[PDB]
Amino acid sequence: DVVISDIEAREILDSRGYPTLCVKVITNTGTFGEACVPSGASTGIKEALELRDKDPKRYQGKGVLQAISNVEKVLVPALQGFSVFDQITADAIMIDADGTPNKEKLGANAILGVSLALAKAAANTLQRPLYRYLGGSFSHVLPCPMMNLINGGMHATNGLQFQEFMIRPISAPSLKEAVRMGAEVFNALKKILQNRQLATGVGDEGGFAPNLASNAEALDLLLTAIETAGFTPREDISLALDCAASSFYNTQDKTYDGKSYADQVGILAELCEHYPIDSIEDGLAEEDFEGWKLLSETLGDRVQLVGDDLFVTNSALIAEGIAQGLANAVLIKPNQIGTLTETAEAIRLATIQGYATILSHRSGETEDTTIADLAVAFNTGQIKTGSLSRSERIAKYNRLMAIEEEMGPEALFQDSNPFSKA
């Protein structure tokens, strides 16, 4: 039997230049797996706790030496000798060792580092693909990506209200071709921006961050780039939004930059009337029940409505929201909950209720590509992992292309958005 022998953890930087951890789980046979932990910027209030050192003289308080210490001093003795293959058991051990609902004692970043690295150690021990180890023999669906080509909100300093302006290459016959379509639209957009004397520096997720007059102008630019690249909007490539509305929600006044939730739903409904948008993420704030209810009644039968901060990849919140008729899709961010076991259960509970799930990066990413394998492992049919620049995004597309090529005739590229324009 192959068991956990040691766990190493080290401080690296993420794609924004902030500390995070890389964790390596080592077995008694010398096999190992290694994973790094991402970090959000527009973090939901109910996300599991990312533990930072708060040393003001070191990385402006953002070190993760304490989380690393917790891996080495607490999680190692708790996990040594347990089977590398008993993923659920190990995740339960770490949850119990922390003992708090939001993983505040040890840190969700410490625990997730181990959780991801453990699964890789087990797959590497078997010499099997991670997506097959995690998802079984019938993991075979490549996800349709939503690609964030213009960045705003907390991912830039351009004053753009919405956070993410995305394209979805829904007519692609393969993931490899979806990547090409997105890359050709992205670089057509760069030239369009340059000719308009607009900035081509990229924001945190690799999309351009120009100063624009409105959310609509960003959607206009995406349409122009789609057509300039030779594709047909709606037919070949549709549009998607992450408003990340909690970022501009005044909880005291209950206003979205001055707008009531009714006004904000009307704004979103108008955008869907005029643009080929087939998905809207976090259109209302994380705890605005009346707003989400009205959004779901208004658009929930015609557009994908993605809860991100609404659900924070949390099985209990997902069940609660589904029971209340809120949204129809769930963004899946493993570090919002802190273990792969809880990530899998969030996917399972949403899926059996007819909700789509979308594996997602964070705005602070690493060279880790685990979410590519996760999207295929669970046959989710959708992924959100960034623009077509910056290799903390590109590496996931490269990994998806490798998975697709490896599977050969087993692979199926298929969008799971039932409201797709195709």
Added chain:
Amino acid sequence: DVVISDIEAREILDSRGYPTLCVKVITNTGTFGEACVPSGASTGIKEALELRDKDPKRYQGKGVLQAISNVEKVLVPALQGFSVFDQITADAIMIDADGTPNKEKLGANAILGVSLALAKAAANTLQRPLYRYLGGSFSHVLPCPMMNLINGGMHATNGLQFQEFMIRPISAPSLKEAVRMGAEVFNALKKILQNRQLATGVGDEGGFAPNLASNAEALDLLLTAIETAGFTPREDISLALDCAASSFYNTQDKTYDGKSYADQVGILAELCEHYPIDSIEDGLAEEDFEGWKLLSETLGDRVQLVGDDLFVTNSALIAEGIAQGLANAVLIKPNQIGTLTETAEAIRLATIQGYATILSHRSGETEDTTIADLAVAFNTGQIKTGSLSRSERIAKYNRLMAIEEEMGPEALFQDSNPFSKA
């Protein structure tokens, strides 16, 4: 007797969203190594040929299917059965198979992909660190980085004349501390720019790309960021430039945006008098003999003078330039010449003449981290691998920190710039 059994190649995207290759060399025992190939923007005219497909309907003609085909159909038969450890032999076989000085038949990108992946396959077969396999048992010097925090030239569309404005954290006692210092300055600079209503979108190498009035303004901003992070300019952190002067050299009349080579040397001398610059790369254009001679006579005993396009990692040009008294350091970019064997010889010929060498990324990078191992393998003492955002840069810093920790008490962090401000 472990020999080459197969070579796979696949098309991925680089950090700019353009195609490149990743190559996997497989031995008869099943061990393997994999490497990806970077791509420059401000490419010297004497660089070995990057082979592109030129199909206008696919990635705007930038596919690398032909280079991949050359790996699979030409380099596989030429290399099958040769020892995985005979690196010089394999590189010579590939050079002979192409048969042209600049690797124009098969592509320097096809050849380098194999060259890098082969060395990794050999190191992986021995279960030894790549830097020890390549450099031997006394590879132990960690490089002082020069970190490109404000991007201009061909790496941005901001109209900034010089290409790279860098800091060097010369008071760091370790590479991991150099990384911290750079990250703290970078994120201080982000707030400074935002408070000045300047853009914080990043250029190709992860440095900010605001619209500035002059090269001097970018240097002023670096100084302000160093001071704002609580570091002392000159003592803790010095400055460096890559002018990439070929990018603004008019070959019709041999001037630098209108200035003579003597004017341009005078401009650089004045910058060195007013700013704590201890290194200037490609201050004159790649074939400007009189300019480089005057620069070397004027500043060559006071500041590091780095030839990049001047030498294109080419042993014969390095020997000739040294014989002419030009520059005092060489930038080392493996894909400018196309094999590791020729990369190592470029380093050797420069080093024995007292020139420093600096391992370098390209502006189009990947998740590959080979240049981190190369900088340590050859004890170069200096590396140039980007700003503190975008993980195609950060991954090299992470790899260097891993190497440093792995070596324990063997590690020595040491700047090889003999003109350093400290």
